[PDB]
């Protein structure tokens, strides 16, 4: 069980998996997730992913609780920090 973030729509391009936690921009970058990059993600059923527009869990928040082949044009390429919960 992990969250996998994808570069492109429909789980395309580069992908990186992360365990529960609170990831800043620099921490995402270390994990090989660039800024303004996430377009789709897989979420284990039961889990919650809070995707933030700005670093340090600020700016607009989008919430995902299931596999999302397309985040939509509002949330697309905006993830700069993220909180992942196994609940």
Name the site residues for a copy of itself (rule: CB under 8 A).
18-24, 27, 52-54, 57-61, 63, 74, 86
| Cβ distance to Ca ion smaller for residue 60 or 86 | 60
CA 32 to the chain's CA centroid? 12
Residues 64, 43: contact at Cβ < 8 Å?
yes
> Does the footprint of Ca ion cover residue 36 (CB under 5 A)?
no
> Does the footprint of Ca ion cover residue 80 (CB under 5 A)?
no
- Map the footprint of Ca ion across residues 58-77, applying CB under 5 A: 77
Distances (CA, A) of 80 to 29, 38, 50, 74: 9, 9, 11, 14
């Amino acid at each position: 069980k992990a969250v996998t973030f994808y570069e492109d729509i429909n789980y395309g391009g580069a992908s990186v998996s992360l365990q529960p936690g609170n990831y800043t921009l620099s921490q995402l970058n270390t994990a090989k997730i660039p800024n303004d990059w996430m377009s789709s993600l897989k979420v284990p059923s039961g889990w919650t992913v809070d995707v933030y527009e700005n670093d340090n869990f600020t700016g607009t928040k989008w919430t995902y609780t299931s596999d999302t082949p397309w985040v939509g044009n509002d949330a697309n390429d905006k993830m700069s920090s993220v909180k992942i919960y196994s609940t």
